[PDB]
A paper describes a structure:
Here we report the use of “Build and Retrieve” to define the composition of a raw human brain microsomal lysate. From this sample, we simultaneously identify and solve cryo-EM structures of five different brain enzymes whose functions affect neurotransmitter recycling, iron metabolism, glycolysis, axonal development, energy homeostasis, and retinoic acid biosynthesis. Collectively, the BaR approach was then used to reveal enzyme identities and solve cryo-EM structures of these brain enzymes with resolutions ranging between 2.69 and 3.40 Å. These enzymes were identified as glutamine synthetase (GS), ferritin (FT), dihydropyrimidinase-related protein 2 (DPYSL2), glyceraldehyde 3-phosphate dehydrogenase (GAPDH), and retinaldehyde dehydrogenase 1 (ALDH1A1). Interestingly, malfunction of these important proteins has been directly linked to several neurodegenerative disorders, such as Alzheimer’s, Huntington’s, and Parkinson’s diseases.
FT is an iron storage protein characterized by its unique α-helical architecture designed to uptake iron. FT is widely recognized as a critical protein for iron metabolism, particularly in the brain. It participates in providing iron availability for cellular demand and is also responsible for protecting cells against damage from iron-mediated free radicals. The BaR protocol allowed us to identify this protein as the FT enzyme. We then determined the structure of this enzyme to a resolution of 2.69 Å. Human FT assembles as a 24-subunit oligomer, creating an overall spherical structure. Each subunit of FT presents an all α-helical structure and forms an elongated four α-helical bundle and a short C-terminal α-helix. The bound Fe3+ binds in the middle of the four helical bundle, intimately interacting with residues E28, E63, and H66 of FT. Interestingly, mutagenesis studies indicate that the E63 and H66 residues play a key role in the process of rapid iron uptake in both the human and mouse FT enzymes. Our structure indeed depicts that these residues are critical for FT–iron interactions.
Author numbering:
A (entry chain D), B (entry chain Q), C (entry chain F), D (entry chain E), E (entry chain X), F (entry chain C): 6 to 177
């Protein structure tokens, strides 16, 4: 046992280890997306910048979870990061839609984790997810929904003018 | 009676009290409009900013009227602010059209008030409405008519590209 | 349903809509109070400034709640803002006492809302009320209790010297 | 009763009063430790600086708890601060080990207090302990565990070179 | 024996250890006083600030005595800090009166200590109490007597206006 | 085929895709290493900082390779990032030794890739590996060999003083 461990269930430690894997996978998906819009046949530079910064943020999220593990006396066990479930992302609209789907998946995993903490009487873990994850996620979900709405309104995916214009004004 | 009251008819005091209620209602309508364009299914950020600043201005208008009441020795009596007559505002064009309709309603109430002052020999009240309200209103009406014209020209409400583009260049 | 809605009960959405109405009413009460102390027969300038800034803060509180509604995929439904339950507020002490009463009413509505979130497993809403409302309210209640205590000590409401002196040193 | 009291159980008030006593005792223990390493026969200047700043922090923690008591309408009742349970602290390693033991004791008292708040439906108190105490404590526990690990690795307590070197590089 | 001990009687060492306990108790009394005037039913903010800074000063006095002990080769032995002899301090005037009483108690303990040094031929200890304690105490006693005089003159404790006014102009 | 593809063999494209996977794996190994030295039972803060920055660099290396793929008209295909082959890294010396082993593995993969380019007449790819990878790798290998030499000289892994001292002076 760790000399610093206090009120840290094995279930929580394990759930944290799984959260790290999911955040790392999310970063990989966004790195796939960013470079999709770097192709000469896509060329949406701002779409690429968006998913690159999202990828970096997800990595920061994983590194914060790993730090918490170490601070709670839990032991970080790492697993394989699976390949993004897609390689060709089609339009910018489909990529935003995929991103929303993945963010709502993380938020749920995070909510399930907050429930575990609430069920194991882990007030510190609760505050941590509330303080550093929950609202961030609600904020990403809303940004993506709005991106998706505007893209659909401007006529994307069929209007390439829209995706290009969306790139210059919003993502730009 | 107030020790500072001089040439202030009861009719004017009452008309001022009613003007305050209308300005407060106008602020509420614009607050409804601003948050309509904050929805994930609308996402017109600049439309939201426009109606938010309009809401703030209408509140300033009410507070100036309340100050005048106190300065003229009139007693401010407040009434219930009714709920904006709409909750779903549809397109950005419909919201601008509603805003014009409400501004022309305030200007008329203001003109009727200027008539009361002119009929009660209240030169101070007259200058006040002339100095702080009338032209402001003519200026809002013209800005809204132009917004409405450009939106209709660009193809709004049916062209979402137009509303989005209108948001980025004019409201933006 | 909203594309961004996740773990957001109808009860919570409705409770948020009601919280917005109460915050808007609180702003109206403080606007009534501010202009009460702008009368020539009252003339407590700092009392007026206090309740004006409180009014503005309550409006900011409502606008933050409306933003949260939009971010959680809830739909903002607005209701009529009732007239402040008083028009003549008597002394500065009575106004502070009314303000305390209304703040403890909001805090309770907020606490009841935090309970609903805790009962619907809404950790995000919980943090939101904890992060942006609860302590703020405890802080307002304490400022008002202290204002009320000092006013009663200095001899207010019967000592006009006290209310005037309280205005210059504390509110001033 | 206090005019500002709302949702504040007697149990919580009492638990807060006891938390204040423990934080004050912790400050006394750290003041004993700081001056232990100021002796001519010890002379670990940085060890002294560490426990002095820790002592000051614990005092700030008590003063924040006393402020919360006053803000919640609870009445601060103070008890005797017991003498630190030790006078000679031996090596720097033993002092760090004592400090860890005492920090894990405070964190537990804090966790028990968070449970009381969670059991009395005190969301404000909950956030307060989460916001200002819990993570701070997890952070102190981890800093001390690491200090203890490095000291044991470098060969302390038997190697005076280690304690001296630890003083110059880490505490220094 | 300490390698640095020279002309340091056991009586002096013990008297220094007792002086430390009294200074620590004085700090506790002032911390009780400071938070008394932070209550919603008292609300004398400047009275609170006064006794808080006094509390901090008394702690500095104890820490200087502990440093001297270490420098003279004496060994610091710590005892329990008793609870302030009061919990409710009534008026600001009574608190000042209590503070004077406690300061004259410390000065006497300090004078008795200076006598011990003069009787044991400890010129260094003599200068230390003369240099860092005696005049400071005479200066605190005079500030408190003057505070007490002005409070009694302005009509305190019965005039709450006085205590409030005293807070804004002198303590303020 | 891509409209920008010219002198880009399928073998090279595939070798680039494999290089990306290896660089991503290297980043994962360094992230495992960094957090190993963040444990309370390890606590080598500078060792953690070293492997964290190395992890970031390897990610930059992968992202540069992905950019080159897009610029040469090759299509990025991503595969699963395997879990670092170790979870407990033992001493700081073993971690450096592992890092050397992995860097010499990447350099070889890079050299094999430079051979493929030289064999397919791809002068651009050749310069790219020469310009951005080869020397960097020779420079990392030498830094790690030197780190390993100094650690072994100072007595690590058995001397914890050495690892701690190595952390403060070199990594520090
Ligand atoms: Fe994330
Ligand atoms: Fe207006
Ligand atoms: Fe509010
Ligand atoms: Fe503490
Ligand atoms: Fe003193
Ligand atoms: Fe690399």
């Amino acid at each position: 046992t760790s000399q610093v461990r206090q009120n840290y269930h094995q279930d929580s430690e394990a759930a944290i280890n799984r959260q790290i894997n999911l955040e790392l996978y999310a970063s990989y998906v966004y790195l796939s997306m960013s470079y999709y819009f770097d192709r000469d046949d896509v060329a949406l530079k701002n779409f690429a910048k968006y998913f690159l910064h999202q990828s970096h943020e997800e990595r920061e999220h994983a590194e914060k979870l790993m730090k918490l593990q170490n601070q709670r006396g839990g032991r970080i066990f790492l697993q394989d990061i699976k390949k993004p479930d897609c390689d060709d992302w089609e339009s910018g609209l489909n990529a935003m839609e995929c991103a929303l789907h993945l963010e709502k998946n993380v938020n749920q995993s995070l909510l399930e984790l907050h429930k575990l903490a609430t069920d194991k009487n882990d007030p510190h873990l609760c505050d941590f997810i509330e303080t550093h994850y929950l609202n961030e996620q609600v904020k990403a979900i809303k940004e993506l929904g709005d991106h998706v709405t505007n893209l659909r309104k401007m006529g994307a995916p069929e209007s390439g003018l829209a995706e290009y214009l969306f790139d210059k004004h919003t993502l730009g």
